[PDB]
């Protein structure tokens, strides 16, 4: 009070000193049920693949691509990534996901990698240098043990032109050893650009169905369309917190209310265009919003000449969010409530006045 009034001796009265404010302690983040799961199931266990070179591409759109099902299973065999860190895939949003898939054998899993080129570097699907993604290759020897060794996934071999990153080597050009073109069926040094499958169940361990679904990522300037789910905290009530709901973000308490919103209605506003009601994302309960307690601090002093003990008056605040005596204008901390009525000496508000009487103590 002396610091604000710029003096050393003050007289009787109620002086304004400062303005206190309660700060939010914790933070609550609420997101609704995780719906619209990305259909990543059909990418692994489905109908047969077209061919090795004729691989099919499946783009990704706005969805919820959860990764807790890929690196948490045992049906796969290889999960070696190339700088992806699957432990943090739930907190990373991408825009371009390439769900390449084809059929290879057990010995061709090694030849398909950015660090090991060769047979699959210029004759079939090639991989770039960066290749932000993980290779998913599992042993498909569960029911792909048909008789006769059906060779329908014929991979094109001995091709001249090198294959491009994320492309297909579709070229019906016969193998020419360096002579005149035959333009026929295995003529003068001619070989049709096709190789024979047929990895029968009684052929070998290395020659087995090993359908691999190659997966990669790519970032662009477009907004994040594909990303994993988000987290959610526990609901708290009757406390000045900082809520972080789906669309709203602010501070204030979150108590119960008797208001009833329409099915489509989510938010809630007052006459002065201020947020005062919110709806729970997870459950169905209208949560009321009320700003936390603020206001100025006033002191009731009997004058530094007589004595030096003073009181404080937190104006407008309840006495639970701060001897103590709840008045109609705050909580007068530092005074006793006497029943005898006297003349008003120091005005406080709503009739209640203070004075320095008898052992000497501030009365209200």
């Amino acid at each position, epitope marked *: 009070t002396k610091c604000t009034l710029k003096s050393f001796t003050v007289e009787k009265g109620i002086y304004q000193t400062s303005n206190f404010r309660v700060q939010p302690t914790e933070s609550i983040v609420r997101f609704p049920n995780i719906t619209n799961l990305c259909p990543f199931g059909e990418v692994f266990n489905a109908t047969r693949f077209a061919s090795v070179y004729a691989w099919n591409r499946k783009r990704i759109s706005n969805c919820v691509a959860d990764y*807790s099902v890929l*690196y948490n299973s*045992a049906s796969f*065999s*290889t999960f*070696k990534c190339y700088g992806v*860190s*699957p432990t943090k895939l739930n907190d990373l949003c991408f825009t371009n996901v390439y769900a390449d898939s084809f059929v290879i054998r057990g010995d061709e899993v*090694r030849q398909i990698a950015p*660090g090991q080129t060769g047979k699959i570097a210029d004759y079939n699907y090639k991989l770039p240098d960066d290749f932000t993604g993980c290779v998913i290759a599992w042993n498909s020897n569960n029911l792909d043990s048909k008789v006769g060794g059906n060779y329908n996934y014929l991979y094109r071999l001995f091709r001249k032109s090198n294959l491009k990153p994320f492309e297909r080597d579709i070229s019906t050009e016969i193998y020419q050893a360096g002579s005149t073109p035959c333009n026929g069926v295995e003529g003068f040094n001619c070989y049709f650009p096709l190789q024979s499958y047929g990895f029968q169940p009684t052929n070998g361990v290395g020659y087995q169905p090993y359908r691999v679904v190659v997966l990669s990522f790519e970032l662009l300037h477009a907004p994040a369309t594909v990303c994993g789910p988000k987290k959610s905290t526990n609901l708290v009530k009757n406390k000045c917190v900082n809520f972080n709901f789906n669309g709203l973000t602010g501070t204030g308490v979150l108590t119960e209310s008797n208001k009833k919103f329409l099915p489509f209605q989510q938010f809630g506003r007052d006459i002065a265009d201020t947020t005062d009601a919110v709806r729970d994302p997870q459950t169905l309960e209208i949560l009321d919003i009320t700003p936390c307690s603020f206001g100025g601090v006033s002191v009731i002093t009997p004058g530094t000449n007589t004595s030096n003990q003073v009181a404080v008056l937190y104006q407008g605040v309840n006495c639970t969010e701060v001897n103590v005596f709840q008045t109609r204008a705050g909580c007068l901390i530092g005074a006793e409530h006497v029943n005898n009525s006297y003349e008003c000496d120091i005005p406080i508000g709503a009739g209640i006045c203070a004075s320095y009487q008898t052992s000497q103590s501030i009365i209200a």
Partner: antibody
Amino acid sequence: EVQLVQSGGGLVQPGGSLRLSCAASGFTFSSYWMSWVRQAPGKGLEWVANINQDGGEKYYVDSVKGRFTISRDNAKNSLFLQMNSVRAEDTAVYFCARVWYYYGPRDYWGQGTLVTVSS
Amino acid sequence: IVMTQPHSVSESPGKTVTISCTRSSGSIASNYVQWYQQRPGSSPTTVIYEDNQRPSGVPDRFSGSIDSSSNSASLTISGLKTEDEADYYCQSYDGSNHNVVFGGGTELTVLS
């Protein structure tokens, strides 16, 4: 924050066995796999067996396949490993460790159980 | 399938001495490679996992690479001091029958 403890055996004998219990506490024991790894005195490490979330699959190794029973109660957050017909080469210290993900390492290990067979 | 590893190794505080871990069948670039450290008289702890990367807490001196030449791996442990004299093991998921194969161990010591 994660501090795992385990006990339930100080001495065993051929024929009569017990059940090792690994108390799960600290972390969230509802989204992680479990597997046992034993260590023989003067040797390296050996993978005993694995276990799914609650009751999915119980993968065993071909060495102890048919004489070891693993279990896991996801309700009470406990890991039980019961033995039967203890052999002679099973003298090793067993460790309890949770699996971050099926293709990753073990985050937190246990403390060790001195289970030895001696006449 | 077995994981080969040198039995013992000893040197003086100074340059780094890597530890090799050569496989027997399959590919080394098909699964991750982890390195554990087992202090004598306590429980093992993870030092480096996904050798191309390294976790927190452990100093960055512990480094490791991948050698796809003959399906092997290397753990270039730099900064040889007294607080690093312990045992180390090799581990890599290779068994298609849901089997986790481990290494043999080492006896890396110092010269005092």
